[PDB]
Symmetry: C3
């Protein structure tokens, strides 16, 4: 058996909402160390990496390593049948070809069991050589989402320019152009309100806004987001999933 | 004249919202005892019965029995022009054949009058035999609505059964299957939260979820809903309209 | 240079939202005395006049008079990138063919600069003649908006009838008819509920509800609206923009 019980089930709801518009189907790699998923979008512009560590679950059992092929649209539809306060259990019997999802309402005597048909996927995994970035910007996730939404009404590409003291986002199109400058904050009450820049050298890169707007579907997972940038390599947009791991999106820059 | 004054005019707004998507037109039978309406949907799968007793109105006068043919879409449009706190009066002047609606805003100096054209309807209407049911479930209306909504995203038919400690709902379709068990418990704050099951013998029946999702448009009328079930007869879904009567929906089962 | 700083930037957001569906493109006339705009809709049934006086701005400089041709759809898209609490500055360098818009977030270290491309417009500007009105009604803007929305579900034309005691709105269509009467309030000065009538003689006029329902996009600018009416002349629907001026819509009657 594989069995993972998650008291904060809404985490899984949010994870699916953060994946299903970008990726139609993916392999969920289950092992004793937790749940991993890596997948490229169909136009091969971006890659998403999910980690949910075994220790983040309330109980966790994995007797054999699995690669479950999942239609993410189907799994999203099922997770929409869970209430936000539900305890959610994922379960797969060693030799079965389905994934079971159990939703327990904690302040109600309601229990739902869903059985999702799996699919056969040949996914070749790709190694992300780890690296050091020229600029890492940490900022409120809502602010990043608003910026990418607003600029997408101006143009389809955003130039992200980062220096010591601020980050600038600019776009250009038929109606004209726009630039948004966020300065580094000094004094904030809540760390989560900060803008923080760690800069080794300045960078200026161009990215497709449509893809950024897919990424910001993760916004409910975290109050903050980090952008990691170097010349000639993909941007990494990272959302921590507290106690569990993360969702990282990689976006190839424009030439 | 017919004249009926309802201080809680939102009741009528809710009733029309509960009817108009299922039934396009119906006869409103007005007598001294109140308002009665019975109608089949156009595919002859379901029947709806409304009762609003004279004593539930603030004032009520009916000099002669009427059968007013009403386009429910039209009446709904008119009742949408009433505020939720309005006092609503229905009137048919001594020998008119329109229905007049008057909306008085209780905390504002605004009065609206609407005159709705009636239509000629030839309805044969049906005898409801009293019967006893094998299982009668009372449960929170919002929970029933959520269940029917969720399961309709899984399949188009629901199998409803009763265990001695709960009621079960299941559905099956392209993406897989779901099963929901609502169990009884004494740990409720409010009576309206209670699941009550009166069972003479167990039942298992299948019904079209699309029709159930029309019926749950009545959810605003009551915190609770009653399901009455026997083998080989229609399901009855009943919403009490407190102090006034009820809206009952009957649904023919599938084999 | 032209430069106008507005601490209550949401005013400009609200103005564009009030204009852009009715008028696609218009000339913004800039002088030392402030900002003026006048335009007809494409079907030549209505005219809009905007005034924003220089003294309503927090700072205002205009070195030379301008006639900036603006695609309102484009300017709306840009102003939707401003937060509701933003300070908004409009700026145009004497010889440039663009309008700059700067949005400062007051409780955040975020500054946005947008440059909007202008267009060449040949607009003939119309003389508004000498006209004394038979009736002038002041009433809550939200109530006027609700009335025009509700009646547009009954018919496509409203008859507006004004007398000493009240103003009446009526419509007639396929399903029947509706009439709404608003009485003059004795105690007043609560803008959100006061109805006040100044009447030389009673009037009754007919107008196209579809245009009124464009005008009420201005509702957020003011708690109150003023309707000015005489026989055989356009209705004036006026929204005060406190500290600044007004937005006035003129609508030709149906004869
Ligand atoms: Na439970
Ligand atoms: Na009143
Ligand atoms: Na029981
Ligand atoms: Na600031």
């Amino acid at each position: 058996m594989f069995e993972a019980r998650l008291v904060q089930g809404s985490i899984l709801k949010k994870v699916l909402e953060a994946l299903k518009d970008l990726i139609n189907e993916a392999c969920w790699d289950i092992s004793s160390s937790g749940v991993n998923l890596q997948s490229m979008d169909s136009s091969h512009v971006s890659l998403v990496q999910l980690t949910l560590r075994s220790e983040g679950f309330d109980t966790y059992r994995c007797d054999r390593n699995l690669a479950m092929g999942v239609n993410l649209t189907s799994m999203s539809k099922i997770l929409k049948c869970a209430g936000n306060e539900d305890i959610i259990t994922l379960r797969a019997e060693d030799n079965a070809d389905t994934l079971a999802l159990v939703f327990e309402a904690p302040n109600q005597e309601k229990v739902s069991d869903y059985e999702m048909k799996l699919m056969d996927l040949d996914v070749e995994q790709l190694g992300i050589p780890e690296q050091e970035y020229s600029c890492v910007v940490k900022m409120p996730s809502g602010e990043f989402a608003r910026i990418c939404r607003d600029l997408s009404h101006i143009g389809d590409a955003v130039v992200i320019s980062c220096a010591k003291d601020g980050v600038k986002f600019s776009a250009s199109g038929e109606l004209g152009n726009g630039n948004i400058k966020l300065s580094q904050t000094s004094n904030v009450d809540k760390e989560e309100e900060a803008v923080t820049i760690e800069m080794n050298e300045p960078v200026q890169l161009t990215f497709a806004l449509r893809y950024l707007n897919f990424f910001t579907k993760a916004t409910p997972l975290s109050s903050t987001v980090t952008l990691s940038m170097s010349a000639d390599v993909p941007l990494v947009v990272e959302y921590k999933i507290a106690d569990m791991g993360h969702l990282k999106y990689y976006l190839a820059p424009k030439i």
